[PDB]
């Protein structure tokens, strides 16, 4: 099998601060992640698909990197509508499709 | 946006991917001029015939 | 740009079946995947089930093998799951998702999302 | 977090034999692990940085071997003056800098 | 061949405050990282806090997160430690490292280290 984690659950910054956030698996997946945005209100949205390539049409500001068994996920500029909860999942164990835990962020 | 600041950090982590850990690279360029050569070797001198 | 509404929410007692249709407008469907995923009202999002571009290969979760049923109709450009035997733990919020490539298991995740609809199994 | 355990804790030899000492950890560390002597009447002392790299000034009797999981240091001469306590650390996960056990080692 | 000479230590009771001195000569004390780390009496050895090259990034003990400070003066090429709140446990030794890198979390670790001063937290 395979576990994710996330070692933040809540963070704070402000509009012009810069956030980082982990995701550890039980093991190696070999860069086999993807980082997904939910917005409480609409459906969620795909923000990274493998270990560090962006998916068109979103903004540059997300970063994504790590590879084997940890992965992170920063934002340099912090708009004021990035808040929503924040997903990785693994697309390369047996388990199909293992999401991990929510990521809440909020801007204070 | 439309204007991106070209200076970015790495994120060099001690488990990054192989590729993704950072080598350090020196690159040693030589010119050879008619100018006497002030760098040479360690092969040592005898006494001319 | 792509669309993907979905249909069916509702409310029925456990032990009752229901049924979901999503369909797309955006998009070429002949030849993309498609997936059900399930939201908890106070957890994270989980995946249910998935179907290829073509009915060949087709993948359940664990937890719902046997019991749930996923069809696919490429001609009206459309998805359904019918959900049988529902329990008390199946009150959650399911989207559409379609996937980047072709086959059921593979890297490629998740593109494009569509907003859930709403199921509640109670009386 | 990081648990690491000392196997061998106490041993005994000669003048003339060959020792070896293993460290165990809860998960693999990328062969990040250094090797510590602490002599009783002076301050402790580096000699294995790394997976098999030899810390230079100290005699090439100590090898180090093992990568990932599980390491292992081994001494083949034995000589009078080895009279102290083996320490295996990892710097690898997150909590900083973790120190094993002690492990002594004695001739009779 | 460096030099680490260490002060500072003696006996006190619990609840009060002192200062530890580490002074190298040895070497450039201005590019190297800096680290305090404890000797149990009768149990292995383990960290307590470290300082970089320069000033800004610092980082300390699970079981010392607001309780020491760590301060480095480059230009007499000297650091210290401030013991505030001790209570029975800190009487160990305490020993002062020299990281190989210049960095605070890096899988460089000690190269040369110093003898250790002994403290005493009691009535």
């Known amino acids: 099998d395979i576990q994710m984690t996330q070692s933040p659950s809540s963070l704070s910054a402000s509009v012009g601060d810069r956030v980082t956030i982990t995701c550890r698996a039980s093991?190696?997946?070999?860069?086999?992640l993807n980082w997904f945005q939910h917005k409480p209100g609409k459906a969620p949205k795909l923000l990274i698909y493998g270990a560090s390539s962006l998916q068109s049409g979103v903004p540059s500001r997300f970063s994504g990197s790590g590879s084997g068994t940890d992965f992170t996920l920063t934002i340099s500029s912090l708009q004021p509508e990035d808040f929503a909860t924040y997903y990785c999942?693994?697309?390369?164990?047996?388990?199909?499709?293992?999401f991990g835990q929510g990521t809440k962020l909020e801007i204070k | 946006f439309n204007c991106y600041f070209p200076l970015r950090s790495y994120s060099f982590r001690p488990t990054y991917g192989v590729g993704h850990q950072p080598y350090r690279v020196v690159v040693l360029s030589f010119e050879l001029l008619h100018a006497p050569a002030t760098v040479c070797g360690p092969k040592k001198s005898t006494n001319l015939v | 740009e792509v669309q993907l509404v979905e249909s069916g929410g509702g409310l029925v007692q456990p032990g009752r079946s229901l049924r979901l249709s999503c369909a797309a407008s955006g998009f070429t469907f002949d030849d993309y995947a498609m997936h059900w995923v399930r939201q908890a009202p106070g957890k994270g999002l989980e995946w249910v089930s998935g179907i290829s571009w073509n009915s060949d290969s087709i993948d359940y979760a664990d937890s719902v093998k046997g019991r749930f049923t996923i069809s696919r109709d490429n001609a009206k450009n459309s998805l359904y799951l019918q959900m049988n035997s529902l329990r008390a733990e199946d009150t959650a919020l399911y989207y559409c998702?379609?996937?980047?490539?072709?086959?059921?298991?593979?890297?490629?995740?998740?593109?494009?999302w569509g907003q859930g609809t709403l199921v509640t199994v109670s009386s | 977090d990081i648990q690491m355990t000392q196997s061998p804790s106490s041993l005994s030899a000669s003048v003339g034999d060959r020792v070896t000492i293993t460290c165990?950890?809860?998960?693999?560390?990328?062969?990040?692990?250094?090797?510590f002597q602490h002599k009783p009447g002076k301050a402790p002392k580096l000699l294995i940085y790394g997976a098999s790299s030899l810390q230079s000034g100290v005699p090439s009797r100590f090898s180090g071997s093992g990568s990932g999981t599980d390491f292992t240091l081994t001494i083949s001469s034995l000589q009078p003056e080895d009279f102290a306590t083996?320490?295996?650390?990892?710097?690898?996960?997150?909590?900083?800098?973790?120190?094993?056990?002690g492990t002594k080692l004695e001739i009779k | 061949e460096v030099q680490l000479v260490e002060s500072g230590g003696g006996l006190v009771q619990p609840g009060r405050s002192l200062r530890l001195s580490c002074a190298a000569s040895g070497f450039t004390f201005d590019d190297y990282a800096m680290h305090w780390v404890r000797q149990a009496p009768g149990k292995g050895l383990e960290w307590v806090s470290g300082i970089s090259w320069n000033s800004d990034s610092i980082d300390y003990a699970d079981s010392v997160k607001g309780r020491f400070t760590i301060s480095r003066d480059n230009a007499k090429n000297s650091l210290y430690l401030q013991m505030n709140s001790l209570r029975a446990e800190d009487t160990a030794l305490?020993?002062?490292?020299?990281?190989?890198?210049?960095?605070?979390?890096?899988?460089?670790?000690?190269?040369?280290?110093?003898?250790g001063t002994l403290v005493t937290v009691s009535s």
């Open positions: 998702a379609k996937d980047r490539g072709y086959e059921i298991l593979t890297p490629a995740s998740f593109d494009y």
């Open positions: 999942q693994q697309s390369y164990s047996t388990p199909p499709y293992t």
């Open positions: 093991q190696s997946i070999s860069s086999y």
